Design a protein around this ligand. Structure first.
Ligand SMILES: *[C@](O)(C(=O)NCc1ccccc1)[C@H](C[C@@H]1CCNC1=O)NC(=O)[C@H](CC1CC1)NC(=O)/C=C/c1ccccc1
Ligand SMILES: *[C@](O)(C(=O)NCc1ccccc1)[C@H](C[C@@H]1CCNC1=O)NC(=O)[C@H](CC1CC1)NC(=O)/C=C/c1ccccc1
Lengths: 306, 306
């Protein structure tokens, strides 16, 4: 038993991190087969950043404008193109540690593990959720650009995030592995603000099911609710509206616990209206929204402590 | 910026996990050079566990009583001995992925990363602290025995924990890599209870320094306190007494922020006495005690957001 924000084991990703330098700018890149992926702003200098024209800035570089280092070893660049907000650098050597992989664009509310990296050297690993406002609450310092997010399913690594920027509120923004930003953000050193955020309702509910699987029932009640009545309370507490598709996703957890979804919604509504009255759930005093239903099934026992 | 419970990158440890089977019992083991380490209860059957005599149970096995699997590959055992609560199995092949390593016994209040493992296959990674009562708040299911805890410093892995049991309250207990238990616990399927726990004072203070490094000052105040006056309030809130050595450990953080330790103690005392008044610190509504001063220096910027 127990319940923790767990990340995926990071080994397969560690063996793909490199350093990419252009001029005075060093950041991290990702070496799969004979391509290295990195944020396109590696080509920029201080001056360029308020208002860069990347097409203009890039045509002025050659292959040898880029230095790629994998550990001790210099990799020779032999090709370069820009794909949305990344560069793809062709190199002379195929990464022998390339895992089986794919690139996915993850959806708001989904979770992934981040491998924080500095100078191509992995520093730490942690789990986070893509927020509804398309940011992540990471932990990232100067040098972290190019750090990747990922999920692992059955020895296949699904890359989903590359790091690019920190916003004024201290949260983080970046792209998928085709270089398309998550959210309305752009890679310029300008003023941009996160949109207003909301609590991820589906995940809160999934975590309450986890608390029940792990043997705690205190917050349950004898009521039920309709969706719609649930949703009027949700809006007032800045929770995402729940939908029938979300109700259906909770099926498996519902069956493992014998608690119908709308019954767990009445439980949630009562917690939003009355507080937790100094009690905890899975050790927390707050309602947690950074575990998906999938995260719950993966970590919790397949048998309820009834 | 940002602040997260971060674990060490897990790659070096992943390449050392194996499966160890004896009779009907399968659990995980740790393969360094030509030794495999595992919990000694792998030799036990259901029957044996209420009251095992391991010396008696072990003399009745041979080398071939043990099956070791590294991925697809069977490793041949050629030697066996018991060291406290572990077995050391000599094998015919030296692990080619053996990292640079050491074995340490960690102290109460220190932190490490756990690589949760099932059937020799790594499943997840998370950070936790050795509690003052010598337990950890892990997340561990059937099959997790043999999962290891570790720290990484400068490409050297310091193993410090191997997993053995879950207590009735849902927290976890095990040994260092010489097989000595943390705490008063024994490897028998009997009734044992965690001793009463306390909050780790030094870590709470270190995390308040992190909140200041990251630019938040709201909880500060104009007071100071003596140690002793601090400690009378500590005892009443089930906090560990603070000592002069702990005050000295906080030196570097104190200097980076310009906040004297006893001034941060007055801040803490005021938070214990008055609450947080619906406010948060580093995103939390609770006082966090699972970051050491070292964890703070490692993750936070070396320059304060003043
Ligand atoms: C990455 O570019 C990065 O790490 N680059 C390498 C590097 C940077 C600085 C010194 C040495 C090496 C930056 C990562 C940021 C920095 C702080 N934490 C992070 O996550 N990214 C940026 O600096 C980024 C570049 C922009 C093109 C996209 N800009 C910002 O993060 C801007 C922040 C900002 C601007 C204005 C007001 C408030 C915040
Ligand atoms: C490990 O032994 C383990 O994983 N073994 C492999 C295995 C076990 C069961 C099925 C299939 C494979 C156990 C890990 C525990 C199980 C639940 N979560 C864990 O952390 N450890 C034990 O079962 C352990 C063995 C004892 C010799 C030390 N016992 C306990 O954990 C006992 C718990 C208990 C007993 C009585 C009351 C309440 C709790």
């Amino acid at each position: 038993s127990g319940f923790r924000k767990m990340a995926f084991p990071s080994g397969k990703v560690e063996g793909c991190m490199v350093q990419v330098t252009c001029g005075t700018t060093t950041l991290n890149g990702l070496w799969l087969d004979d391509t290295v992926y990195c944020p396109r702003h590696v080509i920029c200098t201080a001056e360029d950043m308020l208002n860069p024209n990347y097409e203009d800035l890039l045509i002025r570089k050659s292959n040898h404008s880029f230095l790629v280092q994998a550990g001790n070893v210099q990799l020779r660049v032999i090709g370069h193109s820009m794909q949305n907000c990344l560069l793809r650098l062709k190199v002379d050597t195929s990464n022998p540690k390339t895992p089986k992989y794919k690139f996915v664009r993850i959806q708001p509310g989904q979770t992934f593990s981040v491998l924080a990296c500095y100078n191509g050297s992995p520093s730490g690993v942690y789990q986070c959720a893509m927020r509804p406002n398309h940011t992540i609450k990471g932990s990232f310092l100067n040098g972290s650009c190019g750090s990747v997010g990922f999920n692992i399913d059955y020895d296949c690594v699904s890359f989903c995030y590359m790091h690019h920027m920190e916003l004024p509120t201290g949260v983080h923004a970046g792209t998928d592995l085709e270089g398309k930003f998550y959210g309305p953000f752009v890679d310029r050193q300008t003023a941009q603000a996160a949109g207003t955020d909301t609590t991820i309702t589906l995940n809160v509910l999934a975590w309450l099911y986890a608390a029940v699987i792990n043997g705690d029932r205190w917050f349950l009640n004898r009521f039920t609710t309709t969706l719609n009545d649930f949703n009027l309370v949700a809006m007032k507490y800045n929770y995402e509206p729940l939908t029938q598709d979300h109700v259906d996703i909770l099926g498996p957890l519902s069956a493992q616990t014998g608690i119908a979804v709308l019954d767990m919604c009445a439980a949630l509504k009562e917690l939003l209206q009355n507080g937790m009255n100094g009690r905890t759930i899975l050790g927390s005093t707050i309602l947690e929204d950074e575990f998906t239903p999938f995260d719950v099934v993966r970590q919790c026992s397949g048998v309820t402590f009834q």
